[model samples]
Target: LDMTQTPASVSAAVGGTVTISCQSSRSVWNNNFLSWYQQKPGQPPKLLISDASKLASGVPSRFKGSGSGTQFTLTISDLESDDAATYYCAGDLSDWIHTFGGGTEVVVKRTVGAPSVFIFPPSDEQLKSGTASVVCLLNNFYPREAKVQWKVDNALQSGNSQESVTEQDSKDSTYSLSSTLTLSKADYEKHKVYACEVTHQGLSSPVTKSFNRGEC
Candidate 1:
């Protein structure tokens, strides 16, 4: 009962290698415990794969994981500057225990000039009882209308949330804003600071992304 998609979200060639797809509506073939995570901000998640391609001890080698019954792939061949960070693929449906797949924000530029946008989040510590989703990925800009609010301790999050907007294909012909936030697990481990505010109206300053859970 969880799905994901990232067909094409701004990729202006520079070595070219951006593939993210994880599908599952039912049949995971007994859910063999597939996993992948890389959320950024304060830094706390970096495990590329587990049980599926068997590569989660340190996760390097450019990050590559194969597929299985429910179709999975997470490959980042040569995208540096921390490789931009943002990738999540999970499945452990042994009666609904773990499920997450809606994250793919990886940007790395300078094949010519300036380009830098990296925001990734979707590793809620293997979900124990529902509600735990984080996403914030914005690139360039355009005719915009984006809003995802959730902030605690700084106050301004009303709970029970949902917001999604997708568009990408750029070299400055911009469009990349992926925002999703759902919180629980004791308000994300007693929120020290959980922020994801990205408002667009010809931007002046409205791109805040923060998360704290002891690095999860």
Candidate 2:
């Protein structure tokens, strides 16, 4: 038996609350024996809630766990930087049989803010032929993580080389990253409109920028 956890990623401010949900199959629901663990970066997993709803010994009061049947929830209130960790829910039916949730990543931010976006027109290689690439720069985001995608007419364009990474600035403690998408000149002409869509936890809707051919 295995457990699943979501939303995969969640964020909250110092005083806010965030909830991570876990779902199980047969063993967990019928017996109702589960445990939630919080594992900070580089730290061993520590118990938070167990026995389905009871707070673990020495754990904070803000962390609450409750559930029945196949659905379970772990709610963390009064969120602090300490809550920035990965949480896992485990189903312990017998002494040796243990099933674990995929785990949810919690990010405690100072405040939520949407990332600023800029899409740069494809450069010459500095200039190139079918190898031309369009670049999108995302900056000034509160949370340290965001998802980026390249699209045309709402259709997503994917390639391993276009995957981007995030970097943080210490001065303002904001996050920034860049994504690149390569398309052949023939492909580019098919739809001279390329959109760089950025999705972040801070924004309710994705912020997108277009690399329009007319701008070239």
Candidate 3:
């Protein structure tokens, strides 16, 4: 019986720790079993934990694994650039069968800084008739203390704008801001300029990204 049928997703508040465990339906009497692998771009999976975390022979000590019985734990003391990959847990329950946990994806970002913005509805294509929305993510800046705006067709936008902020993991601590613009996909596809702008303490001028939507 496969024990990995359940898929897991979670949102952890910044600076918090999270743990996900996987198990087998049954265990072999004395078989030393359990292994972990990490998958990332341009690289094959690397073994992380094995035989319950005894360094997995040559695995680095920065990654730690511990547990007993049918459960296992894989931990990274400090998450870094190379650590941004999906993690999987596997175990051998009997001589002929094995099972694995559904992979887990981890994302790491700033806890604080100058407001940084990202454009959403990432693709440059949109549906033709109905209204479509463009989202902007601004990290590490505040609106009450700063000036932020959305522009469409080279003109300043007024109503129907939305904004929000989220805390990041730094001592200078940053937050996130987002804004959305709505328009008929036909008009959006015809328009050439759509931008999100942020004016903050360090910038010499407003930063904007330009894009055009085409019929999809």
User: Which candidate tops lDDT?
Assistant: 2
**RMSD list, candidates in order:** 17.9, 7.4, 9.0
> What is each predicted model's overall lDDT from 0 to 1?
0.62, 0.77, 0.62
Kindly list the per-residue Cα lDDT of model 3 for residues 1-216, writing each as its tens digit: 454522353223334444555666675224447777877656687788778676666766767776666656766655554455677877777766767778776444433236666876534445544767888776665322455687777888788577665433233334466777766676566776778887776566787765655423
Candidates' TM-scores?
Answer: 0.25, 0.53, 0.50
Q: Rank by lDDT, highest first.
A: 2, 3, 1
Total clashing residue pairs per candidate? 0, 2, 7
Give the Cα error of residue 210 in candidate 1, in Å.
38
Clashing pairs in 3: 111-168, 111-169, 111-170, 111-174, 112-173, 112-174, 166-176
lDDT of 1 by residue, 1-216 (tens): 465646534342446677777776664644446777877656676777786677777777667877776777777676555555567777875676577777777665432311223445446454466566766666655544455566666888665556544433334434456656667666666666667666666656666767665565
By summed lDDT, the worst window of 10 consecutive residues in model 3 runs over: 5-14
Residue by residue across 1-216, what tens digits does model 2's lDDT show? 367788898877678999999887655634678889998645699998888888888998899888877788999999876666789999865646678899888766666677899988766554454666788888788766788988876788876336554433424446678888877776666776788888999888988899667564
Residue 197, model 2: Cα distance from true site in angstroms: 22
User: What is the descending TM-score order?
Assistant: 2, 3, 1
After superposing candidate 3 on the true structure, give the runs of residues whose Cα lies further than 4 Å from its correct spot. 4-18, 28-31, 113-216
